[PDB]
Design a protein around this nucleic acid. Structure first.
Lengths: 47, 92, 285, 119
RNA sequence: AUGAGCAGGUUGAAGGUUGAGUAACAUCAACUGGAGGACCGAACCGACUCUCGUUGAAACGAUAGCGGAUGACUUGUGAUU
RNA sequence: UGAGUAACGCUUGGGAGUGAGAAUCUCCCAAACCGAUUGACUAAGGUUUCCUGGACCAGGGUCGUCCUUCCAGGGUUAGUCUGGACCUAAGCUGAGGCUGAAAAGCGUAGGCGAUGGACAACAGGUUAAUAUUCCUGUACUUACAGUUAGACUGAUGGAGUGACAAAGAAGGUUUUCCACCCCCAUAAUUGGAUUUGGGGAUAAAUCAUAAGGUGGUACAAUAGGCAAAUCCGUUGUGCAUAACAUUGAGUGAUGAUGUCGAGUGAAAGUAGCGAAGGUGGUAUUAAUCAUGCUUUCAAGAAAAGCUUCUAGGGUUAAUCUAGCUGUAACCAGUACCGAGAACGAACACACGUAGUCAAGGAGAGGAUCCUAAGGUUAGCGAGUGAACUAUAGCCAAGGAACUCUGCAAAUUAACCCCGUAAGUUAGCGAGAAGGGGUGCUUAUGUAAAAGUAAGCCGCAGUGAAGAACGAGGGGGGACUGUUUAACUAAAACACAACUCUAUGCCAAACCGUAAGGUGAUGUAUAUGGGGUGACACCUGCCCAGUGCUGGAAGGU
């Protein structure tokens, strides 16, 4: 009786945090295409 | 002390309740870009008198205007409450 | 020496045995030292990248590898006295505490026939032949017991250093080197006659008669229970596949990989080391 | 069905009737439903008939049909009853109370009825 | 890698100590002993039949019980495949 | 449309008031409830849902004058606590460098990364919110610069320590509990009353005592610990009574001229007021001693950090101790919900999830009923007692005849007293099987009591709650065990073991292409791969073909 989503801000900071997010160029091309697609939300810091 | 951190004092219900007592706990709103020591000595420099004790918190950014077509966010600002020796009171 | 284990349980019995731990071993309550103990890490059957490389590994408790003078040439020509014989869970045999006279300690692997309080000398010169001594291979008469021999010049003994292991001497070669030695498990080769070795046979003859008794003890040793090859699907395993308790139906089956393992020797013969071998557990060369 | 409300069970009904007769003895006027008033009328008439003698034994049984409120105590209630109210209705045979049905409750259009009492 | 915890009632093994006893044994007797992929039995882990129900409270629950319940222990925090 | 339709998402009634308008808003009285929770602390999380006043557009299973709903205002305080300024474990990044079409990967020096080590403040107080955080009392701690008083300190390197498993038992300590006593309220009117019920606390910190606990202690040097050593260590001499080094509950004084304390008490049960504020114990309990000791093997973290030796240096002193004085102690954090009316929940979905406190009586238990403090009416109600559904209470007799079916469903379990067969690989079987009885009162009881005798009641005394239905035989599997999310829980898998093969170090094999690594920080008594899979006896035949190996002559 526990779904697959478990919220925890610190583990999020390590997982989808920008400073950890500079691990591969794939992330930069993906966020570049996101910017080209005008996504106002690009990071967890800007929810 | 850059003379740009101490913005204004505040006056609220709990502020009035604490000031009618002898706590001498003057309250101010500032930029959170200064430490407790930094804010206390900044107050000292801008007034020429050293404070007794300073406590600091922040006004947590909360949604403003509630539920509407254009919701917003409350500003972030450090609330600093200072104590003074009972013998003196400052003029604002 | 082993002793049968009284199961004392209400669910069947157990066919396991246990080492004496009382007469051949002292201070069962583990009170070891600090300097030369470093935690022997277990990879859990994985490489340095985290991918799968080994099967059925894991389940052991924490064990500390003992920094042991394997080269046995770090300090020589100094007399020492055996202080104790301590169990080594990290290796087949058991370690031993000896004390150098200069003010330094020492942990070696000890053979059988040694007790607490015996005088042992380590040197690069012809010294006592009784087991445990470390002495170069240029001064031993043939037909003797010796173990823990290295092949590199000052490489450290790493061969036949398990419990109940040794080697034999079968003459030299007409090159000033390549002394003929009967290797363990029936092999025979030629190694350097100037290397180091630990004479005698290794102790703890018990491992040939040790029965785990239960699956859980096997997990606790490290070898986790694993699935047979025939138990998988045909897409995963060659033996696996087909339903109805189907046995193997092909000649000389392969591994889970494309490798055929029965009847074939897995080694390269083009090395000059191959030409330096005497026997292969069957006959000459 | 499975787990649900206890509903109308005899224990709940008897506790409710006892509480309501306690309330009507306390205040003198109670507004209930007719489907409860009908059997509470018999229950209260039997209570009145049971202890008009005003003896110690009568108090012994009637201590088992009274409850407490926020205005008086059960001891005060029984004392006042036995003193003057209980033997009041010994003149006419029955008919000590009337249930006059008022307007329905606003909540679910359920009937309301007030209870009054005189000889 | 680092840890939390597995109530209570328990049962009372070898080892050993001693004595009788034997030439040595052996055998027996009294005792400490708290071990058992040991028991009942919890919190707990998970579900073996039927049942409610299957536009259900339910994209799998609940109950009548159920196997385990000191060990092939349940599980956490962070990481890996 | 079906349709005014199934349900109305696990639970009351009354009085009074507000409001024009009341089951739904408020205050209170009961009831039955969670109560090893319907309690509290509470990691973590969502983040204003937290609080006051106004109101109910939208959401709330009718409604909602209300909601945790919206509007306006208000709300989170840290030298001592949690996460930084100290540190690292797995693991991660990674100067360079290596490998590698680029790309990228490896990984060195390094640097990050608590669920941890060292590590300085407790109680009381009020509020509409919190307050190891604001106030009072009581304290302590670190560097800082001067200071006098004492002294040569000793690190960058080395060493000791830090630094550690699991399980079991009994000892010391306050405790819990019991009776007594003191204090507090306290004489009942419905038969007898010649009362019942409650309470009896004080700490941080300082000083002394420290019950007790652990492990050599004093002397001389050495060939080891890049250098060196007085430090560690080695060998010697003295004593092994414990000298010795060492920690330590709790105890006594402050602390404590105080708070507090049930209760008493002005329109709030609030200011104020406030009595006592102890004795002996334990054959029950928890924790300090306790990184204690012993036992078993599965052999049981590092770094930081304290002591610390020489190094290094110091000298009109480096360094450092004590005392005094002054300065100051920065970062995020503090609301509630918090195994959930605030998390997951697609939801105000009857559900479940870190750790901690954890009542009493009956019982060993925290198994089960009841209630303690606290908290509660699970945001549709009212009816009547048709069929049928869901659950139960009852059923006699036949008593498994039903059906493939003892699927489903009823005695049975607690207490003690007896007693228990075959087989056995001597473990078990066995709580076998199969039975006796269990209440109260009087006396006696022992350390409490079991237990015994006398008497009595009922139809019967785990009186309601919680407690197993067996024997005989077969097939497989020995067994304790893993199971296909959620159609199916095992004779399948696993398994100890048996067996064969391969592997002698740049080991065989494995990951990529590759450095390199697992293998393995292994060393043939080890590992890998193939077959079977308690125990015992064995596993007979043919290498026909095929396969695998060896091979030397020789045709290709």
């Amino acid at each position: 009786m526990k779904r697959t989503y478990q919220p925890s801000k610190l583990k999020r900071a390590k997982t989808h945090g920008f400073l950890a997010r500079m691990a591969t160029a794939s992330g930069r091309k993906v966020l570049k295409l996101r910017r080209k697609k005008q996504r106002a939300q690009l990071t967890v810091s800007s929810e | 002390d850059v003379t740009n951190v101490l913005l204004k004092p505040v006056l609220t219900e709990k502020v009035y309740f604490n000031q009618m007592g002898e706590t001498k706990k003057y309250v101010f709103v500032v930029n959170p870009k200064a430490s407790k020591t930094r804010v206390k000595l900044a107050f000292e420099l801008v007034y020429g008198i050293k404070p007794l004790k300073v406590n600091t918190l922040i006004r947590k950014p909360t949604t403003i205007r509630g539920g509407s077509r254009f919701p917003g966010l409350s500003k972030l600002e450090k609330l600093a409450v200072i104590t003074l020796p009972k013998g003196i009171a400052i003029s604002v | 020496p082993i002793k049968k284990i009284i199961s004392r349980s209400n669910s069947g019995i157990h066919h396991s045995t246990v080492i004496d731990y009382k007469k051949l071993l002292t201070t069962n309550k583990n009170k070891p030292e600090k300097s030369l103990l470093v935690t022997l890490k277990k990879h859990g059957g994985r490489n340095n990248q985290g991918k799968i490389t080994v099967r059925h590994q894991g389940g052991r408790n924490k064990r500390k590898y003992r920094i042991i003078d394997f080269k046995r040439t770090h300090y020589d020509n100094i007399e020492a006295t055996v202080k104790s014989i301590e169990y080594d869970p990290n290796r087949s045999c058991f370690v031993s505490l000896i004390t150098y006279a200069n003010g330094a300690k020492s942990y070696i692997i000890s053979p059988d026939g040694i007790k607490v309080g015996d005088k042992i000398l380590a040197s690069e010169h012809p010294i006592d032949i009784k087991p445990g001594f470390s002495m170069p291979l240029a001064f031993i008469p043939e037909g003797t017991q010796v173990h823990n021999i290295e092949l590199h010049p000052k490489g450290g003994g790493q061969i036949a250093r398990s419990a109940g292991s040794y080697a034999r001497i079968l003459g030299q070669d007409e090159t000033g080197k390549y002394v003929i030695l009967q290797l363990l498990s029936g092999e025979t080769r030629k190694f350097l006659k100037e290397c180091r070795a630990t004479v005698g046979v290794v102790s703890n003859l018990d491992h040939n008669l040790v029965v785990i008794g239960k699956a859980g003890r096997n997990r606790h040793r490290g070898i986790r229970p694993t699935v047979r090859g025939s138990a998988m699907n045909p897409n995963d395993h060659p033996h696996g596949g087909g339903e109805g308790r189907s046995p193997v139906g092909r000649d000389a089956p392969r591994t889970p990989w494309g490798k055929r393992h029965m009847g074939v020797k897995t080694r390269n013969m083009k090395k000059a080391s191959t030409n330096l071998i005497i026997r292969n557990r069957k006959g000459e060369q | 069905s499975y787990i649900n409300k206890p509903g109308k069970t005899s224990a709940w009904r008897v506790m409710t009737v006892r509480q309501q007769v306690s309330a009507v003895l306390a205040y003198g006027k109670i507004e209930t439903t007719l489907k409860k008033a009908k059997n509470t009328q018999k229950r209260l008439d039997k209570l009145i008939t049971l202890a008009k003698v005003d003896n110690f034994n009568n108090r012994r049984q009637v201590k088992k049909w009274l409850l407490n409120t926020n205005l008086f105590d059960v001891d005060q209630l029984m004392d006042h009853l036995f003193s003057k109210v209980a033997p009041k209705y010994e003149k006419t045979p029955g008919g000590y109370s009337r249930v006059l049905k008022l307007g329905p409750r606003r909540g679910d259009a359920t009937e309301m009825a007030i209870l009054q009492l005189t000889d």
